Amino acid sequence: GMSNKFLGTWKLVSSENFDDYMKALGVGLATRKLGNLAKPTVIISKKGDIITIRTESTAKNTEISFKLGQEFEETTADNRKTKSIVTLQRGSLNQVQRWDGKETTIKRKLVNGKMVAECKMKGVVCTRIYEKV
Numbered sequence: 252g253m254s255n256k257f258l259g260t261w262k263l264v265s266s267e268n269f270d271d272y273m274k275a276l277g278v279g280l281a282t283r284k285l286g287n288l289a290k291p292t293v294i295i296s297k298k299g300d301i302i303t304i305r306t307e308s309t310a311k312n313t314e315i316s317f318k319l320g321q322e323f324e325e326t327t328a329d330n331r332k333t334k335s336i337v338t339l340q341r342g343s344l345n346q347v348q349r350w351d352g353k354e355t356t357i358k359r360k361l362v363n364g365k366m367v368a369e370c371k372m373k374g375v376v377c378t379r380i381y382e383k384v
């Protein structure tokens with residue numbers, strides 16, 4: 252299952268192309284501003300076979316818990332109600348969210364000790380880099 256090196260508290264240090272990604276998701280302007288300003292903390296933890304990803308920012312927190320490979324209901328930070336599945340592919344922790352026949356992926360991998368998240372909607376790609384605190 253998931254590498255223990257994912258477990259811990261992660262802080263955003265770099266974001267690329269997040270605004271166009273949020274536009275692809277249908278996010279409104281007020282919320283995009285929040286998203287472009289935020290420098291969230293992402294906390295990855297595991298208990299039994301359940302992984303939890305908790306995101307904290309000044310303006311919004313989110314939290315998901317899941318078993319690898321098992322679909323679950325999710326309410327995203329921009330208030331989409333999705334059905335989501337997290338898988339593991341060659342060390343990459345990959346989240347797919349589906350709603351209304353739409354799909355977006357968030358792939359989280361470790362690179363030189365940093366967590367790199369690739370976000371993709373309709374071919375629009377962003378890259379968000381985190382340092383482990």
Ligand SMILES: CCCCCCCCCCCCCCCC(=O)O
Pocket residue numbers: 273278282283285286287289291293306307308311327328329357368370379
């Ligand atoms: C805490 C996020 C900031 C708040 C902005 C809310 C509107 C956009 C959120 C939708 C997708 C977020 C994907 C995050 C990927 C990551 O963990 O880097």
Ligand SMILES: [Cl-]
Pocket residue numbers: 288289290291307308309310
């Ligand atoms: Cl913040």
